[PDB]
Amino acid sequence: MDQECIENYAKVNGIYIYYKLCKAPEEKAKLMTMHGGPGMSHDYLLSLRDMTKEGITVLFYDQFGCGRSEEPDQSKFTIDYGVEEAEALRSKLFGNEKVFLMGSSYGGALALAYAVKYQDHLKGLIVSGGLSSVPLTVKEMNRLIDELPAKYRDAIKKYGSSGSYENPEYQEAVNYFYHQHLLRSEDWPPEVLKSLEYAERRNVYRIMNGPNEFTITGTIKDWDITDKISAIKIPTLITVGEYDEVTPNVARVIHEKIAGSELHVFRDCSHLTMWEDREGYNKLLSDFILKHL
């Protein structure tokens, strides 16, 4: 039915990286996945496991410094290193095979940076709630914040300006935003909480990203490779939720640059669409993958 995903410890260049590879039956192609954050874990992407019964193998893993993986030197907390970490893993794990790369959110940005350099080692590309620019994302998130009820908006422009991220009136504003643009479900699945827990437990999120989804003061604050992605020539699927915290306008910019790419906006979905519409999401991706073998 399913076959017990297999877990193992790697050792890519210098450090220990955890990776879970759920295989076949009837191997048609492999799909490497990249969780978001930066600084979350592979867990919230587990819903994509269903695609194994479609002949698609889904490779999971905690990126450097995340989840179960060990973190490297701080100077390596970069998207460029994450790229080399992914390529290195692929090469050491699949030799010279071609593969499909999916990316969620910051994982989407990482996937784009990967593809830009190693699309040669790539069969297909999927970007969900991703971005080619952190400054653009931030400007869009600021608009979403301004459409928020005066209370939560004012609470963000007050306690956010004094570093009072711990303040209750501030956390209450973060939950409202999240339940509107991060995940629009009653019962947040367990896998989502584990990744969230992991984000706060390790040091990647705090350093590379910042305090939260809409306060990106970390090291990637100026990252923007919008001018490089048009170099991507492989088949590409871009998805984004209607109420997505990383807005569809952000998704459009990626779409415009990658010729032949398809763009899908899931209605009534936000950022974590794998959970909001698990079935149409898994279907859309598996259809895209198979038709591009």
Q: Residue 66 sits in a domain of what CATH number?
A: 3.40.50.1820
Domain span including residue 27: 2-293
Opening angle at CA 211, ends 88 and 197, nearest 5: 65
Q: Which two tokens stand for residue 18?
A: 């955890």
Query: Other C-beta atoms within 10 Å of 9: how many?
Result: 11
CA neighbor of 238 nearest in space, from 227, 230, 250: 250
- Contact residues for 32 (Cβ-Cβ < 8 A; gap 6+): 59, 86, 89, 90, 99, 100, 101, 102
Cα distances from 240 to residues 93, 97, 127, 253, in angstroms, run 30, 29, 8, 12
256: tokens are 């415009």
**Tokens in use for 92?**
């050491």
The span from the CA of 173 to the CA of 171, in Å, is: 5
Please report, as a single letter, which amino acid is at residue 42: H
Give yes or no for a contact between 208 and 77, defined as CB atoms under 8 angstroms apart. Answer: yes
> Within 13 Å, how many C-alpha atoms sit on residue 54's CB side?
21
The CA distance from 125 to 289, in Å, is 9
Residue carrying structure tokens 């259809």: 287
HSE toward the beta carbon, residue 78, CA cutoff 13 A: 9
DSSP bridge partners of 58 = 22, 31
Q: Please, how many CA atoms are within 13 Å of residue 23, restricted to the half-sphere of its CB?
A: 5
* Number of compact structural domains in the chain: 1
State the DSSP string of the chain: -----EEEE---SSS--EEEEE--SS--EEEE----TTT--GGGGGGGGGGGTTTEEEEEEPPTTSTTSPP--GGG-SHHHHHHHHHHHHHHHHTT--EEEEEETHHHHHHHHHHHHHGGGEEEEEEES--SBHHHHHHHHHHHHHTS-HHHHHHHHHHTTTT-TTSHHHHHHHHHHHHHHT---SS--HHHHHHHHHHHHSSHIIIII-SBTTB--STTTT-B-TTTGGG--S-EEEEEETT-SS-HHHHHHHHHHSTT-EEEEETT--S-HHHHTHHHHHHHHHHHHHTT-
Q: How far apart are the first and last CA of the chain?
A: 23
Active-site residues, by number, are 105, 244, 271
Q: Determination technique for this PDB entry?
A: X-ray
Q: How far is CA 239 from CA 32, 169, 269, 270, 286, in A?
A: 17, 33, 11, 10, 13
Written as six digits, the tokens of 267 are 């209605």
d(CA 230, CA 161): 37
